[PDB]
Design a protein around this ligand. Structure first.
Ligand SMILES: [Mg+2]
Ligand SMILES: [Mg+2]
Ligand SMILES: [Mg+2]
Ligand SMILES: [Mg+2]
Ligand SMILES: [Mg+2]
Ligand SMILES: [Mg+2]
Ligand SMILES: [Mg+2]
Ligand SMILES: [Mg+2]
Ligand SMILES: [Mg+2]
Lengths: 86, 139, 190, 62, 97, 143, 63, 139
RNA sequence: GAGGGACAAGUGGCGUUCAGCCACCCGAGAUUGAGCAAUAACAGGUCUGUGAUGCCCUUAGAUGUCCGGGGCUGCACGCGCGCUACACUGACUGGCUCAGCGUGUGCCUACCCUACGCCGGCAGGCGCGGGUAACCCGUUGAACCCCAUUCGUGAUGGGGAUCGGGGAUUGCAAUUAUUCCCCAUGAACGAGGAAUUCCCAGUAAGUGCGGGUCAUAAGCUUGCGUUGAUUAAGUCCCUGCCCU
């Protein structure tokens, strides 16, 4: 029937914002170019700053971890802690 | 490392549109497929669960649709299916997205001819399993 | 024989740059415990709560809102991530900038009602230093919670961001936002 | 507009419609031995150094 | 051969236990101790009222069942001699050979 | 040196013991667990494909801990929170066919001895196997 | 919360009126002296009476 | 030369059998390094990380706990170690060093030697908890 | 089981010799929670608790008492006590690990608690054993929590309402209500205006267990455990009450 609610707060963050499932060619190439420039390598910063989902972000961070460019400090439940040497 | 595969939007059974998050959770979008049936069909198709919907072979898509339309040739015993013995035919089958609503309409159409009060409460604005409807069922 | 240390830390030479908050922050050597999860019995006497360490107070105020009410192991884990994130962000030790953030977390005076049984005017009066510490920790944990509400960022990540942006006056943290919201009303009702 | 510091000598009593403020005759460090009475809300003892934002006011009651 | 002494209240329990000790420790019998059992409690909660008026005020009735056991290895003729005791009525005696 | 499974962390021990049971082939899996079998009373299936070997390793560790458990005892050892939805949760028990399956499989592979009072207990062959596997997991830990 | 009853204070006043040489400044001795010179059923009442007896002894011996 | 010291957490009792040896801590057959919460792997080591290693390698203590909760068992093991050292330094080592190490333990933390009388209160017949009541109904 | 142990006692200050408040040590505790609970009322409720009862009504086609059904649940709405969510401090899977009250059979008149082994995917069935109980379930291997994987801010895998099909359990019978299990359908809900309830330390809250109901039986309630804070120790402004 009718639709009623007591609060009036519309206009959320960004209009059902999209996020890339799979990495592109030039986008992931730019990611590999500017990825040593960050001081703290965390999956949330890599996901939200660089328009990456969490799954692809963790996959790319584990791939670069196996490559050895980024050192692991202490991994845990959900706060994965990486650091670049020097 | 699978850079890019040109596959975003799929068309399954002429009505359903597959998503892009996974494959075992994009088969969830098909009506007649919920939580466990998709992970059963994935294990019958032997697909690695990390793979997306767009990173998957079209021949393997046809194999998954073959397992959808006929699961009883290989495995998946008679209890796991949705459409059990009460068919008017006795055929143990799994419903489709176009088939599920048609079977529900046939259920309601024969219940209106039976004139059971279950069908009567579904025809009225009532609840079948509504043991209390004082506060429950407003607007 | 060795010095008392939180993780691989030292817990030493953390000097408070001003007065009016000494002997209520337990950063000193006689209150340096290894984990914040201790036997909390600091609510029987009126002034035994000030001897609690501020990291334990931060965990205790971080655990809130029913679904997370309790779970000291979880919130000590969150603070263990947060100190590490603050250290990896350009050094600048997390205990030192935690004390600096408690100093710079806003209210040095607040407005409240006076008597006379007449027109409510809310005259701005002075505030207790204990209440400054309490409101500091409460505003920092509330800002961290609503910053890490509905995002990929974690409670510890937004708590580290809140402590850094509260120790540095960049006007981007919830402590500085409510410092604006309270000190403008306090100067208006002065 | 200076900002001064002050440590508590004595505690007079409690004041308010709730009784929440406390009349504290604090003292003055940076100048000579002057005496005003301010209102502090929250728990307080004697000897607590306190940041003042205005030293010209004097809230007195009899 | 054991004897179970189960009483209603702990005062008469300890009195009949002290009487059994005073009547048993003079003979040539290695008397085992009056082994203390944990106290049983039957908790019954009651509405206190025949009709529903007022706050939820509940009676909480409890008992305190106290049980003791003694062990006396002997021929069966000695046990019947020990059993004959002018006893408090709130004490129950069981024997097991 | 003397290595006991309590001296070694389990979170490496079961993860290696699944592979060392895959190397031996100590698993029976007749038809329904070949097809699909769900959890206690849940919605989804377990993820990591060697979960039958993981159940067998957990059963082996529990029979090393306590001697005399059985089907219902190990079913209560698994334990369950039954999220009923709107109605609140309760303690639900696990499945019984896997609880008899793993015991029958380890009996056929000579790792479960019958107790005349209860159920499973450790065999000397299973004792030697678990002790050597704990020793090599402790060697991988110290290396 | 030491605002003990008139019966407690009056019993202690009867004690300090009748027997003064038997009492001292030690609680552990005065509690035992009161159980020889009076009959008190309750152990908390023993402690209360003996504490007020020690307070009366500290008042009388000083002033 | 063997002293058993007991527990006394809220509902956690730790039997700590202490005896002269070469350095061992047994918690139900499981050593000191395996603490069941990973977060509390500094609090139970507070008798270890503060008092030294020549004391650890001098005193063997085996601990068996039948407690009620995880945190309660951790503090029961902590209090049982901190009291088993006091009992062994009463029964074998002189008081001139026992008083020094007891002053060190007391000036570190009171809860090492002093048990805390805190138990959960009885739930009342009026409300859902010990102090809380149910919601009223006015107009 | 008894006895001991805590009394504002030792010190200093605040106080009229005072009654008494504040800070510390020794101590396990500087005092925890309940039951009983004055004179006197409410013209509060119970005749539907009684073979406790006065008065009035019916008494053989019965307002007595049996048998078969329906009803108390029935919904265009409003209100109260509650349960579950609105997620990332989170959901899924796997491994790991800890309780305490209390209950349980052949009953003053019909009756359980459950170990083990087998079958079945599951709820369940079959055979046998123990327990009238610190003996057996049961060293109540509980939930929460800890570690690892998956999801990635999408009304999403959060929420599981509504609804269709099938299978078992108790009952003589669950259909216009059982209950549980399996699949499937997948709504509102984006942290809630005006107002309002409870609470000062193992306390609120999260979370599970036992009993009462029962034959099958909790979201109610009574008690128990696990994890376990932020704030006060102050006043008469809002409300209620007591005294002159
Ligand atoms: Mg319908
Ligand atoms: Mg109604
Ligand atoms: Mg009366
Ligand atoms: Mg009669
Ligand atoms: Mg409700
Ligand atoms: Mg409910
Ligand atoms: Mg019966
Ligand atoms: Mg339905
Ligand atoms: Mg019944």
């Amino acid at each position: 029937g009718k639709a009623k609610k007591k609060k009036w707060s519309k206009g959320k963050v960004r209009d059902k914002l999209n996020n890339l499932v799979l990495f592109d060619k030039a986008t992931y190439d730019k990611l590999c170019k500017e990825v040593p420039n960050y001081k703290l390598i965390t999956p949330a910063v890599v996901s939200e700053r660089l328009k990456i989902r969490g799954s692809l972000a963790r996959a790319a961070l584990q791939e670069l971890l196996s490559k050895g460019l980024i050192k692991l400090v202490s991994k845990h439940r959900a706060q994965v802690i990486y650091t670049r040497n020097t | 490392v699978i850079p890019e595969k040109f596959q975003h939007i799929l068309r399954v059974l002429n009505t359903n549109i597959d998503g892009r998050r996974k494959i075992a959770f994009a088969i969830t979008a098909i009506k007649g497929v919920g939580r466990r049936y998709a992970h059963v069909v994935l294990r019958k198709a032997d697909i690695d669960l990390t793979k997306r919907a767009g990173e998957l072979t079209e021949d393997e898509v046809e194999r998954v649709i073959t397992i959808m339309q006929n699961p009883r040739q290989y495995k998946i015993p008679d209890w796991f299916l949705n459409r059990q013995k009460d068919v008017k035919d006795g055929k143990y089958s799994q419903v489709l997205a176009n088939g599920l609503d048609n079977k529900l309409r046939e259920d309601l159409e024969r219940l209106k001819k039976i004139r059971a009060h279950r069908g009567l409460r579904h025809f009225w604005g009532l609840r079948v399993r509504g043991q209390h409807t004082k506060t429950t069922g407003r607007r | 024989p060795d010095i008392k240390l939180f993780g691989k830390w030292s817990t030493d030479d953390v000097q408070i740059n001003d007065i009016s908050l000494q002997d209520y922050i337990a950063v000193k050597e006689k209150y340096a415990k290894y984990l914040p999860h201790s036997a909390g019995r600091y609510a029987a006497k009126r002034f035994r709560k000030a001897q609690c360490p501020i990291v334990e107070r931060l965990t205790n105020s971080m655990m809130m809102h029913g679904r997370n009410n309790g779970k000291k192991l979880m919130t000590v884990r969150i603070v263990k991530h947060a100190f590490e994130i603050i250290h990896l962000l350009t050094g600048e030790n997390p205990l030192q900038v935690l004390v600096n953030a408690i100093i710079n977390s806003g209210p040095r005076e607040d407005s409240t009602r006076i008597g006379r049984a007449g027109t409510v005017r809310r005259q701005a009066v002075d505030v207790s230093p204990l209440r400054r510490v309490n409101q500091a920790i409460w505003l920092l944990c509330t800002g961290a919670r609503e910053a890490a509400f509905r995002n990929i960022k974690t409670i510890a990540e937004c708590l580290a961001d809140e402590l850094i942006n509260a120790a540095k006056g960049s006007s981007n943290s919830y402590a500085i936002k409510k410092k604006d919201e309270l000190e403008r009303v306090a100067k208006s009702n002065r | 507009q200076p900002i001064k510091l002050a440590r508590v000598t004595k505690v007079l009593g409690r004041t308010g419609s709730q009784g929440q403020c406390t009349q504290v005759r604090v003292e003055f460090m940076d100048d000579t031995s002057r005496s005003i009475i301010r209102n502090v809300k929250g728990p307080v003892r004697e000897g607590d150094v306190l940041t003042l934002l205005e030293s010209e006011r004097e809230a007195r009651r009899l | 051969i054991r004897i179970t002494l189960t009483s209603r209240n702990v005062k008469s329990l300890e009195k009949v236990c002290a009487d059994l000790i005073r009547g048993a420790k003079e003979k040539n019998l290695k008397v085992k101790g009056p082994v203390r059992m944990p106290t049983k409690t039957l908790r019954i909660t009651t509405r206190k009222t025949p009709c529903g008026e007022g706050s939820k005020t509940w009676d909480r009735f409890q008992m305190r069942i106290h049980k003791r056991l003694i062990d006396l290895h002997s021929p069966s003729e000695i046990v019947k001699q020990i059993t004959s005791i002018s006893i408090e009525p709130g004490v129950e005696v069981e024997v097991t050979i | 040196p003397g290595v006991t499974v309590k001296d070694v962390n389990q979170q490496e021990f079961v993860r290696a013991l699944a592979a060392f049971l895959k190397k031996s082939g100590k698993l029976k899996v007749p038809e329904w667990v070949d097809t699909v079998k769900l959890a206690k009373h849940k919605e989804l299936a377990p993820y990591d494909e060697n979960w039958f070997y993981t159940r067998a390793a957990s059963t082996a560790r529990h029979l090393y801990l306590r001697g005399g458990a059985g089907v219902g005892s190990m079913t209560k050892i698994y334990g369950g929170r039954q999220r009923n939805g709107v109605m609140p949760s309760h303690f639900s028990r696990g499945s019984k066919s896997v609880a008899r399956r793993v015991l029958q499989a380890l009996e056929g592979l000579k790792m479960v001895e019958k107790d005349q009072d209860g159920g499973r207990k450790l065999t000397p062959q299973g004792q030697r196997d678990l002790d050597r596997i704990a020793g090599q997991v402790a060697a991988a830990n110290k290396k | 919360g030491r605002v003990r009853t008139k019966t407690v204070k009056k019993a202690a006043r009867v004690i300090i009126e009748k027997y003064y040489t038997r009492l001292g400044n030690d609680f552990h001795t005065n509690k035992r002296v009161c159980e020889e010179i009076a009959i008190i059923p309750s152990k908390k009442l023993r402690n209360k009476i003996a504490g007020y007896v020690t307070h009366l002894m500290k008042r009388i011996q000083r002033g | 030369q063997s002293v058993q010291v007991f527990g006394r957490k809220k509902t956690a009792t730790a039997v700590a059998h202490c005896k002269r040896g070469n350095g061992l801590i047994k918690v139900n057959g499981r050593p000191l390094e395996m603490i069941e919460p990973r977060t509390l792997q500094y609090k139970l080591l507070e008798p270890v990380l503060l008092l030294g290693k020549e004391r650890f390698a001098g005193v063997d203590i085996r601990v068996r706990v039948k407690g009620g909760g995880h945190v309660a068992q951790i503090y029961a093991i902590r209090q049982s170690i901190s009291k088993a050292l006091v009992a062994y330094y009463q029964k074998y080592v002189d008081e001139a060093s026992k008083k020094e190490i007891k002053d060190i333990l007391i000036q570190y933390d009171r809860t090492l030697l002093v048990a805390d009388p805190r138990r959960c209160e009885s739930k009342k017949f009026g409300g859902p908890g010990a102090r809380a009541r149910y919601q009223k109904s006015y107009r």
